[PDB]
RNA sequence: UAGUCUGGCACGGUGAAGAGACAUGAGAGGUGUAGAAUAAGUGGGAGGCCCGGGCCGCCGGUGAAAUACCACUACUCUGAUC
RNA sequence: CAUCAUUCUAUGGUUACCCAUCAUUAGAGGAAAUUUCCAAUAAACUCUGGUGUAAGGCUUAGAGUGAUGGUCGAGGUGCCCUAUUUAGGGUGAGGAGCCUCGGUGGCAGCCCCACCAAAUCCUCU
């Protein structure tokens, strides 16, 4: 029906709308990102452990199907 | 159309019982009409002639590049340059003012053209119709529309209103602008026939009086 | 074409009730964004009006017309009948 | 580049008179359906010059400018069947004709997403 056209890698502004505003979301999941920021879903699985290696987000429980993160702590 | 009561042409000097007001008044004559269509090819158009010094006062403008250099300074012409009619039409839609502030324009000869560019036919649907002639004569040719004929119009409200004389000239000059006005409704007569039903001779500001 | 069916005119009237006109004699009536305002319009217009004093306005601002200041035709209906 | 408007030029056009729609006069025009086709049906709707008046630069050659070296964004509007009627069940075709940076809901605004619409009708079935 309504076919959608996504993108392989980031635009410069879209990473500034990812790296600032995805840590303002609570469900940081690769299914949230590729519906919202509209990318090739495979990408969003890889981007989130670079942010863990950057040290923003919290790996609650990683799985094959769904990897679940949340925004920054309170303390 | 024809009526006439021109056997007792006096009793117009009755001044101080109607007149007691101080501003400059214009004797503006309403006449009663009936049975005319505003929609159709039915016209009530033309300019009724008045040679006997009416002298209409309004927002006056005069142009002309002739031997009117000194002939037009008798009245003190506000002669803005032929070049300087630019913002006359430009400060109209971009700016929200009437950039004219004058209720007449002029067509002249010696040069056959006045202006056929965006400024001339820019006035073509503004009103205040530039029609008058001052071509080749030069006797005065400045006040010879003012001291000459009056204009009127037709529209969708079926009523007529136009000036006949002015307050500076006396009641014996306001009687010279009655006879030579409605005698041009018996000469000018298509078969929109018997248009004049009742006549209201008046001051500017007073009470209704009848000549029929 | 006789006849016959039919409409008009004529002889050919009277009175009332009625429905619509016209001739009329008063009211009420008007909503585009917008400008402070249900912009009915024409020739207007920066002045006049009353108690020297004071008023609505000009212009700005909506928009070919803009409010006080002589008049009158229309147009939506009501509406008295020699 | 194809374009509407802006300022500097305009021997350029007619003042009881010129624009763009609407109101009307004489012209040029079908896919689906239908099933296997064909030539036809029968117009919806679009414009050419005629003419009219409540808003207004007509147009015109052309130097500098609002704004895409791709432009506007482009997602909604209908008809038919039902006692799920604040809702449920259908899907043929082709022209036309319009709003907004819409208000309220969610990982609250922007992106994603949900709903309520600004005016929708004509036609061959």
UniProtKB/Swiss-Prot annotation, chain A:
What domain of life does the native source organism fall in? Eukaryota
Modification type N6-succinyllysine: residues: 12, 54
Query: Which source organism does the UniProt entry give?
Result: Oryctolagus cuniculus (Rabbit)
Q: Which gene encodes it?
A: RPS25
In Swiss-Prot or TrEMBL terms, this protein is called Small ribosomal subunit protein eS25
Q: Name one GO cellular component term.
A: postsynaptic density
Disulphide bridges: none
Q: Does the keyword Acetylation apply?
A: yes
Task: Provide the family line.
Answer: Belongs to the eukaryotic ribosomal protein eS25 family.
The molecular function terms in GO held by this entry are: structural constituent of ribosome
Please give the function described in this protein's UniProt entry. Answer: Component of the small ribosomal subunit. The ribosome is a large ribonucleoprotein complex responsible for the synthesis of proteins in the cell.
Swiss-Prot record, chain B:
What InterPro entries does the annotation carry?
A: eL8/uL1-like, Ribosomal_uL1, Ribosomal_uL1-like, Ribosomal_uL1/biogenesis, Ribosomal_uL1_3-a/b-sand, Ribosomal_uL1_CS
Protein name from the UniProt record: Large ribosomal subunit protein uL1
Question: Where in the sequence is Phosphotyrosine found?
Answer: 6
| Keywords of the record | Acetylation, Cytoplasm, Isopeptide bond, Phosphoprotein, Ribonucleoprotein, Ribosomal protein, Ubl conjugation
Tell where it localizes: Cytoplasm
The entry's family comment says: Belongs to the universal ribosomal protein uL1 family.
Task: Specify the cross-link site (Glycyl lysine isopeptide (Lys-Gly) (interchain with G-Cter in SUMO2)).
Answer: 113, 156
Which residues does UniProt assign to the signal peptide? none
TM region(s), chain numbering:
none
Main localisation, per the record? cytoplasm
Coiled coil spans: none
Output the Gene Ontology cellular-component terms: cytoplasm; large ribosomal subunit
Cross-link Glycyl lysine isopeptide (Lys-Gly) (interchain with G-Cter in SUMO1) residue location(s): 113
Q: Can you name one GO molecular function term for this protein?
A: RNA binding
Q: What does this protein do?
A: Component of the large ribosomal subunit. The ribosome is a large ribonucleoprotein complex responsible for the synthesis of proteins in the cell.
The domain of life is: Eukaryota
- Sites where N6-acetyllysine occurs are at 86, 101, 113
Family annotation (Pfam families): Ribosomal_L1 (PF00687)
Q: PROSITE patterns attached here?
A: RIBOSOMAL_L1
Name the GO terms of the biological process aspect: translation
- Subunit structure and binding partners: Component of the large ribosomal subunit.
